[PDB]
Amino acid sequence: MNVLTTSSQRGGKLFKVTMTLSPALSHHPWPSLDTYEPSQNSYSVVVPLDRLLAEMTYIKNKGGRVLDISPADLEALGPPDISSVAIPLKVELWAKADVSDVQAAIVAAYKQIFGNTYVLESERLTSAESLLRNGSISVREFVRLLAKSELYKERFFFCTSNNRFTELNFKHFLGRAPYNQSEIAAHLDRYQTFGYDAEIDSYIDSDEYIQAFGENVVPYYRGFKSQSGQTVESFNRMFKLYRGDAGSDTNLNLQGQKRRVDPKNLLRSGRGI
Amino acid sequence: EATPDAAAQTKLGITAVAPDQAVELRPNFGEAEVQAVIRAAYKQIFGNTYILEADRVVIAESLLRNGSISVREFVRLLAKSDLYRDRFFRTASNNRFIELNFKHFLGRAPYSQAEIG
Ligand SMILES: *[C@H](C)[C@H]1/C(=C/c2[nH]c(/C=C3N=C(/C=C4\NC(=O)C(CC)=C4C)C(C)=C\3CCC(=O)O)c(CCC(=O)O)c2C)NC(=O)[C@@H]1C
Numbered sequence: 001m002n003v004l005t006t007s008s009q010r011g012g013k014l015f016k017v018t019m020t021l022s023p024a025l026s027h028h029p030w031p032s033l034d035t036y037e038p039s040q041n042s043y044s045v046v047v048p049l050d051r052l053l054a055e056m057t058y059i060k061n062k063g064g065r066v067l068d069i070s071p072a073d074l075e076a077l078g079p080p081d082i083s084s085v086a087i088p089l090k091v092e093l094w095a096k097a098d099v100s101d102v103q104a105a106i107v108a109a110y111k112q113i114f115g116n117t118y119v120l121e122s123e124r125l126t127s128a129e130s131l132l133r134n135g136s137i138s139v140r141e142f143v144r145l146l147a148k149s150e151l152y153k154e155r156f157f158f159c160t161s162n163n164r165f166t167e168l169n170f171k172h173f174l175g176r177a178p179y180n181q182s183e184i185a186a187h188l189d190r191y192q193t194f195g196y197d198a199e200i201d202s203y204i205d206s207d208e209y210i211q212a213f214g215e216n217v218v219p220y221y222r223g224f225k226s227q228s229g230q231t232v233e234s235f236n237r238m239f240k241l242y243r244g245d246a247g248s249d250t251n252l253n254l255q256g257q258k259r260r261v262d263p264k265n266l267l268r269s270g271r272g273i
Numbered sequence: 274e275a276t277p278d279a280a281a282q283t284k285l286g287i288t289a290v291a292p293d294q295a296v297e298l299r300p301n302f303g304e305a306e307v308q309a310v311i312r313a314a315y316k317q318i319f320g321n322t323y324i325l326e327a328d329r330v331v332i333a334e335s336l337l338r339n340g341s342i343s344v345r346e347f348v349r350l351l352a353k354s355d356l357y358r359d360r361f362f363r364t365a366s367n368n369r370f371i372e373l374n375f376k377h378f379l380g381r382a383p384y385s386q387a388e389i390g
Pocket residue numbers: 023034035036037038
């Protein structure tokens with residue numbers, strides 16, 4: 001939830017704490033077995049740093065358990081600005097592209113395909129770049145090569161879960177976020193029989209890819225603007241998948257690869273399987 | 274010699290408070306419902322003393338609306354108030370203060386000299 005003050009009247013960094021409530025922790029003043037209000041299954045409190053230790057011990061000594069702690073300053077921050085992704089920009093690689101134009105595409109591709117994540121000089125792929133700019137490879141095909149590359153696998157696919165990798169994939173290859181639990185299930189099954197290459201192939205091959213930026217257009221962010229057959233919630237999920245500019249998909253950070261989109265949220269948009 | 278049930282209560286005038294009604298803030302609380310918790314809290318937490326317009330604490334009860342703070346946190350804000358200090362603590366001795374805090378914070382009185390210490 002929103003927190004209204006970053007700091008207590010006495011100086012003290014507030015910290016939002018989220019717990020699963022337990023009947024002992026709060027109960028109705030009613031006859032019969034004590035029940036916590038259902039709406040507050042996940043309770044949140046903002047506590048000053050001083051009372052944080054005591055607060056957390058008490059929660060845990062009852063049947064409570066801590067879902068997560070977060071500094072109030074990071075919380076109660078604006079939802080990321082969509083300014084740059086509201087209109088993506090878009091890059092076209094003409095035939096007979098001069099030297100600079102090819103460079104721009106390359107850069108743009110690395111940006112979108114890898115997230116903000118930085119690609120070092122050694123990481124960068126000369127061979128693939130070589131092919132582009134003497135013809136022979138489509139922008140589309142380059143994009144396939146990047147997702148095949150180990151660089152991609154090491155960041156996105158080898159650290160996190162396949163559940164996470166799918167949506168990670170969706171965002172990079174298609175601006176969209178994933179809609180529905182089915183998409184996640186389909187990709188997982190594809191991966192088990194066909195393997196990693198076939199799964200990567202299935203996003204570029206998909207008509208949604210073809211319909212937008214089909215060939216010789218660097219992929220851009222379709223999500224954040226209204227798309228055909230897109231669940232309304234997907235738009236919200238795009239805010240979870242995409243956090244600000246200068247926010248990346250990073251194996252590097254503590255517990256780097258986690259799920260931006262909770263499984264339950266996916267279930268809301270659609271169920272059936 | 275017969276006593277009505279609740280004769281013991283009517284003597285001692287504990288009739289009103291003996292079993293005591295609890296007030297609970299509920300989800301999607303109405304504007305009148307919150308007003309009633311505030312009314313209650315100021316009666317218990319403050320002493321049954323009179324809170325004049327000036328006395329009321331605007332910022333704390335604004336947070337109580339829109340569920341920024343819970344009632345337990347509301348009570349804590351009330352207890353740390355010029356107003357709570359001015360009455361209670363600043364004029365009292367620590368024995369009278371601690372004995373008052375028991376009561377307003379929890380209905381009981383202090384069970385033993387240790388608790389005071
Ligand atoms: C009975 C038909 C089915 C069933 C019920 C069941 N419920 C729990 C535990 C809880 N149920 C609730 C429900 C409410 N709390 C509320 O305040 C309200 C109304 C405002 C409801 C309807 C809650 C919150 C709990 C969890 C905490 C609590 O005990 O109050 C259980 C036990 C779960 C446990 O492991 O503790 C059960 C069994 N489940 C069945 O088996 C039936 C199908």
